[PDB]
Design a protein around this ligand. Sequence first.
Ligand code: B12
Ligand SMILES: *[C@@H]1O[C@H](CO)[C@@H](O[C@@H]2O[C@H](CO)[C@@H](O)[C@H](O)[C@H]2NC(C)=O)[C@H](O)[C@H]1NC(C)=O
Length: 378
Amino acid sequence: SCSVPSAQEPLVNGIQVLMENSVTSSAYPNPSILIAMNLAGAYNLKAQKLLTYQLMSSDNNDLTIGHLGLTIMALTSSCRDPGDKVSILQRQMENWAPSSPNAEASAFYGPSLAILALCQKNSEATLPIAVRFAKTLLANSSPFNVDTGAMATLALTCMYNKIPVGSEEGYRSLFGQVLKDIVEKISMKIKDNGIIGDIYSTGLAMQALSVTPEPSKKEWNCKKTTDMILNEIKQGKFHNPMSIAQILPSLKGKTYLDVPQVTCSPDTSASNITVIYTINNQLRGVELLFNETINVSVKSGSVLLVVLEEAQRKNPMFKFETTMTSWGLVVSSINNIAENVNHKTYWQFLSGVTPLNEGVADYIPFNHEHITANFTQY
Ligand code: B12
Ligand SMILES: *[C@@H]1O[C@H](CO)[C@@H](O[C@@H]2O[C@H](CO)[C@@H](O)[C@H](O)[C@H]2NC(C)=O)[C@H](O)[C@H]1NC(C)=O
């Protein structure tokens, strides 16, 4: 009802190639990219094989609940036995629970990914965990996250459709109800322009909407959203391979639920712009900061990361560390104080007062932008 117009296909093909082309021996092995190219039908068979091998050999002790889920699905989409990882994931999940009943919505993202994976390998063995998961989700009150909601509906839809014959005890009722719940919250996060939540959460939301068993009261204009996406691509919004990985499936009319059905082997300085960069902190382990600066970055371009690099050059001791992930460079430490996920604490970036929608290697700061780095919690 809202496929990509065969006229815009070249556009989709292009980003697919951009995304596959990012796979290299040093590149961070991204399971979402593998899933995406496999659901789309891979172009570059060497990149396909390389990534598949990097994941087959990933160490189970290096992966988080969500990594694990993603990696199990990626291998499966490459028609490779995940073996070991599913057992490991199953037991970690029987041991999972949120930090509290007021835990942030995104706390559920990884677990959603895991349940989806486990659901694909053995639905019945996953009921216990999924029932518990649905109840925990039903009980949470935090402000809604579309990305998480999307993942959660996929996982629950997977279960919803695999209710064991004979085992007829409101499991369907529970999952259906929580799904209805989430769809209502996903809808109503739907802008008039077609965006759902935000651009980088729209791809996942499209998968969820095309797959929940029960739509929301307010109808969703699918075409309006896919058209908005195509235009966004044409404006250079999807240059991040991970961002391509999250919309490609939708653009090809597939979702993570199609993974099990994948067919394999198919037939130093200054310049022109000056930015104002503040770094902050307020705390427990004391050590409070609050120091500004003005940086001279090139043209516009020199991503917001050049700003941080030059600021470290002036050496006001406020240097930093960066850590690699599926989305790119994450600023993990500033002036000798790291993120530490145990304390649900990290560095949040913002323009003025509003948080950035892109990372430091992607964002392009304007004229005299005041970009702050508050060390908050989530
Ligand atoms: C949870 C979450 C966070 C938490 C992470 C907790 C944790 N360490 O587990 C925290 C609060 C730290 C965070 C921060 C930010 N995030 Co965030 N985050 C998410 C979310 C909801 C789920 C990710 C996840 O757990 N995936 C499952 C696991 C298993 O996969 P993973 O690959 O291992 O996940 C890792 C990465 O996703 C990484 N990560 C999280 N956010 C970001 C952002 C950037 C720019 C990068 C490079 C990496 C990164 O954290 C995980 C640790 O490895 C996503 C949604 C999505 N679509 O991906 C948004 C999302 C990835 N985040 C986003 C953004 C923009 C940010 C920030 C730049 C916001 C800001 N500060 O202004 C900050 C940047 C931090 C910094 N200082 O560099 C955007 C990215 C858009 C883009 N880059 O084009 C997304 C897509 C949300 C959206 N729809 O807008 N995030
Ligand atoms: C920067 O970070 C601080 C602390 O993380 C934020 O201040 C908190 O504001 C919240 C409001 O949601 C209060 O409940 C907390 O008590 C405050 N924290 C502290 C340390 O007292 C501050 O608002 C953030 N600045 C932004 C987003 O511009």
